[model samples]
Target: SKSLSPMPQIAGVTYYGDIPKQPKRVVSLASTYTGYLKKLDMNLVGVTSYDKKNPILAKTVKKAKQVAATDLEAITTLKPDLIVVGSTEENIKQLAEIAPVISIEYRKRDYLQVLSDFGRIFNKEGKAKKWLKDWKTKTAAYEKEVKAVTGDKATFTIMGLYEKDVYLFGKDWGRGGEIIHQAFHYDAPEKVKTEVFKQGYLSLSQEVLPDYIGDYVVIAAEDDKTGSALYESKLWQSIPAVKKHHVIKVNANVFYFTDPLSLEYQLETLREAILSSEN
Candidate 1:
């Protein structure tokens, strides 16, 4: 009964040159995937600034130099056997000259499948499959634990605050959506499903936010400044979940990536929130 769906295939990726069966020195320019590379135990030689700053990657990336994707000089010094980036549009020409380059359109496949793709790409299929098997079993257990507290039908909403802008994120979008929607299989309130889910995210006026909120609300932000305004507002206080203490706050940076390491962190964070919320 713990079986998971078949792994999805990777698509919308671009690769150049004959890739090495096992790249000894890999430079990862994709910050979202830096943690993924770390989970796969890749030989990371260098990473971009964003990847360097990720708390989830702090330990793993310490041995790797901080370099910019477009900084050809910095990349040259690393002497990487392969280069991995989020997209192919930037400095691909120069990067390909140095070594085989692979660019992933991460949005093209399910988040979990991306790991399998990376395994195949770097000749680490066994490691990828092993992690996923354990991950699937763990998430299934967490899902049962979460459902016991909130039941099968509790609607959940993932929201983000940036300065003054408010966004309702979709299941495919990051910020804990994958865990809440994909892993736990929680439903979004119909209002959010109708509008926000279709576009991956939807910008909303503070006054209208109440319409999209569900039984449980997960707020993601870089800092609480902007979110605090809404949190203290009359409209926000009037919501049912607000009065019941079902609002959970999570770090935007930590929940922004759907990589395995990041997902593991998010899963634990959410499990704590869901289990401890007032019933």
Candidate 2:
């Protein structure tokens, strides 16, 4: 197993205040970061607390123990060479106590950039470039396949519901936003683009949902109660897509994340959702 040496000159500001040239025995504090690390096939020592129920995560490397919130015993005991996390003050404060931390703050828009950065720091630029190329190929195929089925006229939307409160998403941090709008460039209702999609999605009660409902809606909710409520209500049923049965339900665990790995599953899920409907 080859360990990567950290290079702060290339990596910019890192957790140690000075980026180390070597990043060995790493601890990842977010699944997203871990996903990128796994992309280069770098075996990680520990990971942030993750939902074991997430089946997709199960396929990755074999021996990751949850260390973020578990206890100092789990983290320090591993004696990781470097720690990676999202850019945040709370994590910086806490992780500093253990060792050097590299808090990389990136979103769906900067996904590629993040991978490239990780590659340079981890001494895996070749693999990172390969991964990026693969991503382009996958997304390109998805763009073609999705557009062929849905056409430019059909609109799309993804909703995340929790505690009866509704959260609409766009092409950024929200569920299916970047994939549906940014990558595939699918059309959404005018209201969604103007008020939500471009502006970063809407937060409103069911009363305002009609304006946002498009030709195809992929809803991932915390519970079936709200989605069921929407499905049963006259308002939801009245939408063109809903009436046509194009409204699909996605698994919350899978839908919530848009990491490099999650995108693989999301594209397949979305493709099926669009193609399954005979409409």
Candidate 3:
């Protein structure tokens, strides 16, 4: 009764004697690609993905099934109250007809904004704020740890390889590069400052891999397909860091579209890699 407002009275909805159990049949259409939903600790009813290695449904989803499509017919038969879909989903219109659908927008990496947006929609602002505060506290602790290890002298180089070129990431690239620079105070090579802003993506050929290699080299692995091919290349083996064994291969998902948990993992991994290096 306390939660009811004048609008509810006007709508002719009576206050209930016993509230039904909160809706539990929640489903996510494209969770794996979104990044944040996978980080959520809640119970997801089901997800869409054919690969067993990357199941869309959370582990708690009992007898969860995966499909290439949303399975609107089966979903209508189940009568779920909430259907979470990404804006990129092809069958958003059909899914909307089956149940009340919420469209999640994908933008350049901004974990704070994503958390806040999800909180606003799910009525979990308090929880989200608390989680964010905890994240800041943890980052500050790690920052102190990194400063003790490398002082203000450490430098980092982050790059991704595609086909015949290497692309460097900058402080503004929405990847963990900006966070590593600002949070841990890692320096960039003088040359990086010139081209980093003008083009967040840079092209480096095999002949110039050494030019971009820093005290710490972060190689973004595209996928299993690219990972094997890139690691076996003569150019990749010729890099100074590779020769000295200072190169760190990081997961693209964790480094690029990271959530709070994955961000912590990334920072810890970087700290260990830098502190243990012979530089």
The TM-score values for the models, in the order shown, are 0.92, 0.86, 0.67
Q: Compute the lDDT for candidate 1.
A: 0.84
Runs in model 2 deviating more than 4 A are: 1-14, 17-22, 89-91, 198-201, 222-226
Q: CA lDDT of each candidate?
A: 0.84, 0.70, 0.58
Residue 128 lDDT (model 3):
74
Each prediction's Cα RMSD?
A: 5.2, 3.1, 7.3
lDDT of 1 by residue, 1-279 (tens): 112212233586777766666677889888877888888888899987766656887667788988887778888888888888877457788889988877788578788888888787766789999999998899899999999999999999999887789889989889999999999999999998999897899888889988898799998888767677678889999999898899999988777778888888999999999999954
Q: Kindly give the number of clashing pairs for every candidate.
A: 0, 10, 0
Model 1 pairs in collision: none
lDDT of 2: 0.70
The list of candidate 3 runs beyond 4 A from truth reads 1-23, 32-41, 50-64, 74-78, 151-153, 160-208, 222-234, 252-257
> Higher TM-score: candidate 1 or 2?
1
Ranking, lDDT, top scorer first: 1, 2, 3
For model 3, give the RMSD to the true fold.
Answer: 7.3
Output the TM-score of candidate 3. 0.67
User: Model 2 over residues 1-279: C-alpha lDDT tens digits?
Assistant: 234355544333345544444556777776666777776676678876552434576467458776664356778888876677766536466666776777765553265677788777766788889888987888788888877877867888877886767878777754776678767778777777777765565677987787888788878764566677667889877888878888778776656765677767777887777788765
